[PDB]
Amino acid sequence: GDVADPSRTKYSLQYYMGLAEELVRAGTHILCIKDMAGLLKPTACTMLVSSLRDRFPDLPLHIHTHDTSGAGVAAMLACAQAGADVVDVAADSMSGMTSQPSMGALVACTRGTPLDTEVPMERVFDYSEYWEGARGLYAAFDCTATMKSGNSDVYENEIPGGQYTNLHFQAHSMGLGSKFKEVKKAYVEANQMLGDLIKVTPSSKIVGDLAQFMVQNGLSRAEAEAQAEELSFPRS
């Protein structure tokens, strides 16, 4: 969802704060916000992380996102400014797109501020160069075969990074590769039909299997809900 969007009432700021209170009462050492799709906009980051920090001044706050939207670096900088203690990053050659924000970008942007990571940039470059060579050994599995950059349609479809790559490979294996735009639209419809549940493994796969099933059978949401007693749905 989007805590900065007052029209999205199901996954509101109050929902996140109430769940954080139950997890803190249960004795968590660290509280994590896991944005598995890259949906945290910088404004939503600021609002959520400051509210958590104000409520829990002594608790470590860890923020995880994906750079699927191409805004993940800006989102993590906004979290850090709002009082996150830790952010998830990847080596630069293993960052961006459906991965985490760039380590070198975060280290460079925080340098000489109160948020400095103290990581030497030369060490990040040598680390990235190794991973650039190593990624070349995995060209047969690289998401860049199908997705050349981040995509902002993730704010509409809410498909997690690892599910996007898998759903595309599955759609291609089923002869639906030319219809992958219809599969993404059906993923939104399937999420709503299922009740707009959080989408991460395995729930992200359940929505994916339903979306492929709808596109394969030429079904709209309304037809799939009307015929729900007659249709053989995916096992998941």
Ligand X SMILES: O=CCCCC[C@@H]1SC[C@@H]2NC(=O)N[C@@H]21
CB 43 within 8 A of CB 7: no
Site string for its own copies, 203-232 (x = CB under 8 A): ------------------------------
Can residue 9 be called a binding residue for ligand X (CB under 6 A)?
no
| Subset of residues 53 to 112 that bind its own copies, contact rule: CB under 8 A | 69-71, 73-74, 77, 92-93, 95-96, 102, 104-105, 107-109, 111-112
| Binding residue positions for substrate | 201
Judged by CB, which is closer to its own copies: 21, or 132? 132
Mapping DSSP onto H, E and C, the string for 28-66 reads CCCEEEECCCCCCCHHHHHHHHHHHHHHCCCCCEEEECC
Can residue 128 be called a binding residue for its own copies (CB under 8 A)?
yes
Q: How far apart are CA 20 and CA 28, in angstroms?
A: 10
Least separation in angstroms between CB 52 and ligand X: 26
At 87, is the secondary structure helix, strand, or coil? Answer: strand
Can residue 42 be called a binding residue for its own copies (CB under 8 A)?
yes
| Subset of residues 154 to 213 that bind ligand X, contact rule: CB under 6 A | 162-163, 166, 201, 204-205
Question: What b-and-e string marks burial along 64-82, b requiring 16 or more CB atoms within 10 Å of the CB?
Answer: bbbbbbbbbbbbbbbbbbb
Write out the two tokens for 1: 């969802």
Q: At what angle do helices 203-216 and 180-194 cross, to 10 degrees?
A: 120
Residue nearest to ligand X (CB): 201
Write out the two tokens for 92: 């630069």
Q: Which listed option, its own copies, ligand X, none, makes contact with residue 193 (CB within 5 to 8 Å by class)?
A: none
According to CB under 8 A, which one of 62, 64, 135, 221 is a site residue for its own copies? 135
Provide the binding-site residues for ligand X, judged by CB under 6 A. 162-163, 166, 201, 204-205
